[PDB]
Each structure stands twice: as C-alpha cells, then as structure tokens.
Design an enzyme around this catalytic site. Structure first.
Site, PDB file in Angstrom:
ATOM      1  N   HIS A 163       7.132 -15.458  58.851  1.00  0.00           N
ATOM      2  CA  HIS A 163       6.325 -15.610  57.680  1.00  0.00           C
ATOM      3  C   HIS A 163       6.221 -17.090  57.341  1.00  0.00           C
ATOM      4  O   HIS A 163       5.146 -17.590  56.950  1.00  0.00           O
ATOM      5  CB  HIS A 163       6.848 -14.691  56.565  1.00  0.00           C
ATOM      6  CG  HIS A 163       7.121 -13.263  56.904  1.00  0.00           C
ATOM      7  ND1 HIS A 163       6.139 -12.380  57.265  1.00  0.00           N
ATOM      8  CD2 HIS A 163       8.270 -12.553  56.883  1.00  0.00           C
ATOM      9  CE1 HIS A 163       6.661 -11.173  57.446  1.00  0.00           C
ATOM     10  NE2 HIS A 163       7.977 -11.246  57.202  1.00  0.00           N
ATOM     11  N   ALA A 192      15.707 -18.712  55.343  1.00  0.00           N
ATOM     12  CA  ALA A 192      15.526 -19.314  56.656  1.00  0.00           C
ATOM     13  C   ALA A 192      14.048 -19.291  57.050  1.00  0.00           C
ATOM     14  O   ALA A 192      13.291 -18.523  56.480  1.00  0.00           O
ATOM     15  CB  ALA A 192      16.348 -18.546  57.670  1.00  0.00           C
ATOM     16  N   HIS A 193      13.641 -20.163  57.986  1.00  0.00           N
ATOM     17  CA  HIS A 193      12.369 -19.992  58.641  1.00  0.00           C
ATOM     18  C   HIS A 193      12.377 -18.657  59.374  1.00  0.00           C
ATOM     19  O   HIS A 193      13.411 -18.244  59.888  1.00  0.00           O
ATOM     20  CB  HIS A 193      12.202 -21.098  59.691  1.00  0.00           C
ATOM     21  CG  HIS A 193      11.729 -22.371  59.094  1.00  0.00           C
ATOM     22  ND1 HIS A 193      10.480 -22.441  58.454  1.00  0.00           N
ATOM     23  CD2 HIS A 193      12.316 -23.589  59.025  1.00  0.00           C
ATOM     24  CE1 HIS A 193      10.293 -23.676  58.042  1.00  0.00           C
ATOM     25  NE2 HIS A 193      11.428 -24.402  58.366  1.00  0.00           N
ATOM     26  N   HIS A 196       8.659 -13.211  49.812  1.00  0.00           N
ATOM     27  CA  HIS A 196       8.345 -12.198  50.816  1.00  0.00           C
ATOM     28  C   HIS A 196       7.502 -11.074  50.194  1.00  0.00           C
ATOM     29  O   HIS A 196       6.429 -10.728  50.713  1.00  0.00           O
ATOM     30  CB  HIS A 196       9.606 -11.603  51.469  1.00  0.00           C
ATOM     31  CG  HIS A 196       9.329 -10.862  52.747  1.00  0.00           C
ATOM     32  ND1 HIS A 196       8.636  -9.660  52.796  1.00  0.00           N
ATOM     33  CD2 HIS A 196       9.621 -11.156  54.032  1.00  0.00           C
ATOM     34  CE1 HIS A 196       8.506  -9.266  54.043  1.00  0.00           C
ATOM     35  NE2 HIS A 196       9.114 -10.159  54.828  1.00  0.00           N
TER      36      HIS A 196
HETATM   37 NI    NI Z   1       8.825  -9.447  56.712  1.00  0.00          NI
END
Ligand code: NI
Ligand code: NI
Lengths: 120, 120
Positions: free
Chosen positions: B75, B71-72, B9
């Site tokens: 993004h 998790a999906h 992320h």
């Molecule tokens: Ni985000």
C-alpha cells in the site's frame, strides 16, 4: 520467567519482518526482559506459534504478547488470540499467556507523525 | 498553503478510522498546520482522493501526505503513490504532493511497546 513476544502482521515484502527485528533488537538494548522473541502472523518465519514455543523452551512461564499494530482489527481480535489458544478454534501446559493491547492513538505517535511530516 | 493529510489502511472494523480520527484531532490540538485531513485506503470514507481534494478546496498548494503505517508494504509502495498520481497508471494541476515516510522502527515505538508490555 517472563518473555516478551512481539507479534507483527508479516508481508510478502520484507519490510514488516525487518521492522519487528529492529524493534526486538531495540528492546534487547534496553535490558528489561529475560527473553525476547518475534513472530509474524502471515507469510514469514518465525510464526507466532513458533515464537511462543521458543519462549517456553527457554524457560518462561509468563508470556507477554504485544501486538505491534496501530489499531485493533481482525488479526488482533480473532486470528492472534486463536493462534495463542486464548479463544476456541499450540499446547502450553502450565504457562500463562498475557495478551496485551495495540499501539493505538498514543501521543508519541503524534510526535512521530509531525516529525515524519517535516521529513525528519 | 500547506495541508497535512494523514492516510491509513482502513478496515471493515471501525478501529482503524477511529485511530486516524483521534490522531488528526491530536495534531489539530498542537496548532501546527493550516489544514488537516484524513483518508483511508480501503473500505472507509473519506478515501485518500477525497482527502486530497478536500485539502485543495480549502486552498493548500503543498499537500503533505503522511502514511500512518508501521512499515512499508504494497500500500505504501504502490497503491498510495498510484492514488496520488505520483506513479503512472488525482487531478492537482498546480499543486505539489509531498509523500512522506511511514513510522518505522522509531525509538518512541519501543517506548510505547514497553509500556504496552506492562499493561500501561
Ligand atoms: Ni491491506
Ligand atoms: Ni491482514
């Protein structure tokens, strides 16, 4: 007298809550905890306060909160300890919250990554 | 001829990139991949495009992209496949990107959660 509360980010997509739900069921299959609840930080129900209240109402005095996140960030260092009133700015009375650590860079994660890399 | 690119992320805090870095080093320790790079989606360097380019420059023709996410979400379903040009609207030509699946509700994650619950 102990409850496990698993806490997740939550999303506008459903996959985040699905994950928490599958995880909670998987820990339920292991018969280790008296009480097991899930909470989502944003966008989904139950919320973290709701999950904590629900655990107290089932009669737990030690609430183990595990953040189901890979890394520390703003949610695990500010938002969640706030929501749990462990840090200034619900009401427990005479229970203790035990806030645990995120997943981090665990060897098991590397196992999962290699499997995932090969499409398994 | 194959590269592993681990994608995370990224955050304004440093813990997200630290995690990707520790994970990459741990997969380097296993000697399974010719080439191993990391990329962060927002706020940090290297970026996903940079990581992909860096893998091509070292001479990979099959780029395995593993999203290091539980998790999906938006993004993993839109942003990353966009960045990788797998989805219309990032310059490979004669190489193929292989975009893998996130961690999900793996039994190993439940092992880690129980350990984390007991402060191990
Ligand atoms: Ni985000
Ligand atoms: Ni967030």
């Amino acid at each position: 007298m102990e409850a496990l509360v698993l806490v997740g980010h939550g999303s506008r997509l459903p996959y985040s809550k699905e994950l928490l739900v599958k995880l909670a069921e998987k820990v339920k299959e292991r018969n280790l905890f008296p009480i097991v609840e899930i909470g989502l930080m944003e966008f989904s129900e139950p919320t973290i306060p709701q999950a904590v209240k629900k655990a107290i109402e089932q009669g737990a005095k030690r609430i183990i909160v595990v953040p189901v996140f890979l890394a520390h960030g703003i949610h695990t260092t500010r938002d969640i300890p706030r929501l749990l009133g462990l840090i200034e700015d619900e009401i427990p009375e005479d229970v203790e919250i035990i806030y645990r650590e995120p997943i981090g860079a665990d060897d098991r994660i590397v196992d999962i990554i290699i499997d995932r890399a090969f499409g398994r």
